Design a protein around this ligand. Structure first.
Ligand SMILES: O=C(O)c1cccc(NC(=O)c2nnc(-n3cnnc3)[nH]2)c1
Ligand SMILES: [Zn+2]
Ligand SMILES: [Zn+2]
Lengths: 327, 316
């Protein structure tokens, strides 16, 4: 029953509709970067606008190079940190850097340069299409000791690649934990190891090496969004996001490191295994962050078992009926 | 027969411990005095080590980013260029003679602060200055670096967005950085030579053919028939065979004897047909009659054919 999934893939490929709309966004973003003329946002750049069933919604991240940072871990929560440190000290509240103040001037300088308006990091609605903008510090120092045993790809993309990827800078993003904390972000690494997906360097570059990894992730996200929309009336699925399903997908990738276990003929079986693993994470309330292995996205402190037991029930019914949410 | 190949591969690994700290400190220190001068302000050694049977001889390159540069090719050579962009502009062109003189002059000054002058210390490291250009690579490289069936097209695109380097010789193309990259990341699989199940003999094949040429260059040191051949020819031919043999299973270290034989065979086909294209500039034949004459190739050919016919007595 894999043709119904490829029929979904066929309809999912809204290909030109996102291509023509991204040009309108490119102007707004390029017309946003010049105005942050600010001393505070001098070295601000971006991180190819992403688009996680909604071709009219975008999210771009604005990198801000911050040199000579030093991080204090919050409270054994290995993903949230305080930031310490030719000098810029407006938001420097004592020694910790005020995330709320630093985000306020970011919202302020952006609201000045903006049928384009702003909603309550930053979302806008141009020409009636929305763009989420995110502020991120860049630290070219070594990755925090909380990441050392994460990104277990040595058996899949090789240890030589993992050492190379950990040479790259990491990113911190304002995110409360109960406030004034920044969270570790490796979205750039996620982009890297998704477009260089295979164990073979020529994977998917020829008909004999066509795998179904990207297609499995796309259906995982599509399944979640469809059910997130179907049950919009209640809020049981509001705490789930495509970051969870893509983190689970990465754990299936390190579990099945060979390209032979991802042949496009076995798309139905491979996707069935991807759905099976995501359900196991739901029931056991365990899905470690791919880069911070001690950070549990599915801990009871973040999502309650009632909402996971609801998501599990919906997915189990879907798999047992050839996924009607696709119809 | 492959037992003898692994024997010299073993003896070639014991001569590696002796060593690279003295070379590293002197190259580090002299880079500070280079930033003293404005012309060398952005200068920087590019990755530190370097014949193979000569452990006391190194070769370093010094990258100095020259920006916003227009290259115009010297009369269809497709590999030598004039650098049209202020101490060394003879005309509208620059001058490697004036650049290297200012290089060798500034290089001379700092040295006198037990090292003579290529700086002999015993060991003697050779230094090379390279122009860096982050611009798109010249059109002569358009059909070179044919690795899309071996290391994929994505890797080829990623390598070509890296800068290309020019070296005084007119200035000639140099892709030594790209050579090292594909050498230590050599397999179709990313875990090639990283586990017991995916162990290839590509690197061993390159070391053997280099040791093959150097030893015969030493044996016939007086005949002057092989002094024009260099390890860059061996490595260039090795890359072509890697293109001809993309799959890692065609490089199983179970078949080191056959893999090395297939390497010397291709190298001999280049010597006989007098064609060895530059791996990056396919229209630049290193084995041309204007460079190496036929008598030298025929002598090198005959010497390798006898060697392979007798299980390489030079490897003793
Ligand atoms: O040109 C020759 O026939 C020749 C013969 C012997 C030695 C060298 N010189 C090098 O050691 C070299 N190292 N890289 C290159 N190279 C790069 N792209 N084209 C040539 N030559 C050149
Ligand atoms: Zn693939
Ligand atoms: Zn290998």
């Amino acid at each position: 029953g894999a043709s119904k999934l490829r029929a979904v893939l066929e309809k999912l490929k809204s290909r030109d509709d996102i291509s023509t709309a991204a040009g309108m966004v490119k102007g707004v973003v390029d017309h946003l970067l010049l105005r942050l003329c600010d001393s505070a946002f001098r070295g601000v750049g971006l991180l190819t606008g992403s688009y996680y069933s909604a071709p009219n919604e975008f999210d771009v991240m604005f990198k801000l190079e911050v040199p000579r940072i030093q991080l204090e871990e919050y409270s054994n929560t290995r993903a949230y940190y305080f930031v310490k440190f030719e000098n810029l000290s407006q938001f420097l509240e004592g020694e910790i850097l005020s995330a709320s103040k630093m985000l306020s001037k970011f919202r302020k300088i952006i609201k000045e340069e903006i049928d384009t308006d702003v909603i309550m990091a930053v979302t806008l609605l141009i020409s009636e299409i929305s763009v989420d903008i995110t502020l991120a510090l860049e630290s070219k120092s070594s990755w925090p000791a909380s990441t050392q045993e994460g990104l277990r790809i040595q058996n899949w993309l090789s240890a030589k690649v993992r050492k190379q990827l950990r040479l790259k800078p990491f990113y911190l993003v304002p995110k409360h934990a109960q406030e004034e904390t920044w969270r570790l972000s490796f979205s750039h690494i996620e982009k890297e190891i998704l477009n260089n997906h295979g164990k073979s360097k020529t994977c998917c570059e020829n008909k004999e090496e066509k795998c179904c990894r990207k297609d499995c992730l796309k259906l995982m996200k599509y399944l979640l969004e469809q059910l997130k929309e179907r049950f919009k009336d209640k809020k049981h699925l509001d705490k789930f996001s495509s970051y969870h399903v893509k983190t689970a997908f990465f754990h299936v990738c390190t579990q099945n490191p060979q390209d032979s276990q991802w042949d496009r003929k076995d798309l139905g079986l491979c996707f069935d295994n991807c759905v099976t693993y995501f359900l196991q994470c739901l029931r056991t309330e365990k899905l470690e962050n791919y880069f911070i292995p001690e950070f549990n996205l599915f801990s009871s402190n973040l999502i309650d078992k009632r909402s996971k037991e609801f998501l599990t029930k919906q997915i189990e019914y879907e798999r047992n009926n050839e996924f009607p949410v696709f119809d």
